[model samples]
Target: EEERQFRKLFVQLAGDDMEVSATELMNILNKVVTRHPDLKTDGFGIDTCRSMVAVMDSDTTGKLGFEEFKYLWNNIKKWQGIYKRFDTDRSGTIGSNELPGAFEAAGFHLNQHIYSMIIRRYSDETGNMDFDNFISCLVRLDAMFRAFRSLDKNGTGQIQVNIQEWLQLTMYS
Candidate 1:
């Protein structure tokens, strides 16, 4: 039953844009589920699925409007703490300067041009990336689940992540 629903949602998401091919979606989903494991189960619920679809839909639309994306990503980050980290200066809002560092901290090594390009793609003219937009960027880059899994330690079928375990897993120094 759950597989059926996941397949259905996967199909629906894949059909949204020619650029976002079904093969690509399947590949990403396979990697995502493989790496995270939790998303493979029904733990995220229908709402989580819907939120994922919303980001995919925005990607299909090509614009990824900040308002909608912000709502989506904010919820995801709220659960995962990505947003808090990005608000680097601890200003409670992410600024442009903080974005590159945030991505680097998550194991992404984007050059300045690429980083700026991503920020331009996701943020509004005002340079504000709402929650949904943030999540969509993470999803497209295959970083959202990586960040989430980096935080989720126990494999307990919930998002109750342990920071110490995450540091141990991701720490290089």
Candidate 2:
């Protein structure tokens, strides 16, 4: 039932095909949220298309079929929906004030230093972070978490990072 609705939208976006390119996906998103039929919030736009394309390219074919796209939606659509809610502008970029909420929506908690690093690394001149950058941030955080978890095999949740620890965690991967 839910999947049927998803397929309906996919078809609407795909224009009779079961696959869509990133640009087409981006256009569909932008248009769907443009006026009529209305979304509670805006959809992802061009800025985030590149990141989404990678996710959708599960077959390594550089295009997204229904299976790949559905898989993507199942995994990340929650974040997308939440991001749209915070976006409010249909601009497809996370506003500086919404960054915290956006990160929370993606299920990540960053300390001051890491958060600042993300801002410095990814934020555009306007201080807005695009959806792709946000995803990239999550990927980096996930990598860090996995590295930390590998070291804390005891699960005692106590691990300190020194030079050796840094090299082991970063260099090994």
Candidate 3:
């Protein structure tokens, strides 16, 4: 079986220290829409790309190494698969009514309160979310949830951060 070759294209995207910046990563992801048009929403904007990079940037370099990109790519593919099913009307977007099932399928078992908040935060003026925004929302939610888990180390459902720590987390993310 021939393995997929990501390194060469990664280098082409990175071109500097062998790491892809958020902008470059956005370019790469937006390209995927051409082949998988169903995945096209607003087409992987920079904010989405930056949030995605923050989620996987282990070295705090604000960029993605190959392995990180691979992990993220797999997640995107899986979520992309989820998108079509939840789009329900095949409108190439997820209506507000479809939010719960989509989030559920993505393993985020939230309630109506959270769903409304997500609809407000992620959806457009008409309360519809395109594929790119949906992916961005999922990435952002995953990152925030993981950050909470890391901070809530003891499973006490709470944690304290000093001013500096709080600032770092809030300002960056």
Candidate 4:
């Protein structure tokens, strides 16, 4: 059932398989969603499916255009709501300066020098990140948060000083 829905979305977005083979596209989607379950599990239940489809269908065609699909593929993390929350200015966009506060809100802290380093890790010569780049950054950051949350000992919703104690609380542990 999931495969069928995904395939239908692919066809809709591509309009045809000329630019990218259906099988190839499906493979890529599978890899991405599997690797970053946050993108799929963000909203819960059918909302997850709906948001996934809606982001892909940016044109509101009830079908995805090729460019839209590509955009979604590139920026899945942003649609997953990880980085979007940091746009507190409601600028409908984010700049490098806004990232630190956003990350801090998510319970992570980095000094300006380190934060600048992190930004440099993701930024290009343009000094601005597009949707795709932003998503990639979110994925990496999410991984770190997940790791930290797992190690949070005492089940107190906080990481303990003894990192080893926290490490024991694996995702399935």
Candidates 1 and 2 compared by TM-score, better number: 2
- Model 3 lDDT per residue over 18-76, tens place: 78889988887777764574555657768877878877886788888888888788778
> What's the lDDT for residue 85 in model 2?
77
Span of 10 residues, lowest total lDDT, candidate 2: 32-41
What is the TM-score of each predicted model, taking all chains together? Answer: 0.37, 0.52, 0.86, 0.36
Q: The CA-based lDDT of model 4 is what?
A: 0.49
Evaluation by TM-score, superior candidate among 1 and 4: 1
Q: How well is each residue in 1-173 modelled by candidate 4, as lDDT tens digits? A: 64455556566656465133434444555565445423322222233333334434423444444565555554453343545565545443456666665556544577778777777887666554433445545544554555565466557776554545444322211
lDDT winner between 2 and 4, please give it.
Answer: 2
Q: Rate residue 56 of model 2 by lDDT.
A: 42
lDDT winner, 3 or 4:
3
RMSD of 1: 16.1
Identify the superior model by TM-score, candidate 2 or candidate 4. 2
**RMSD for each of the candidates:** 16.1, 7.2, 2.4, 13.4
Worst lDDT window (10 residues) for model 1?
37-46
Clashing pairs in 1: 69-132, 69-133, 70-130, 70-131, 70-132, 73-131, 73-132, 74-131
The candidate maximizing TM-score is: 3
Candidate No. with top lDDT? 3
Find the number of clashing residue pairs for candidate 3: 0
Q: What lDDT score belongs to each candidate, Candidate 1 first?
A: 0.50, 0.66, 0.78, 0.49
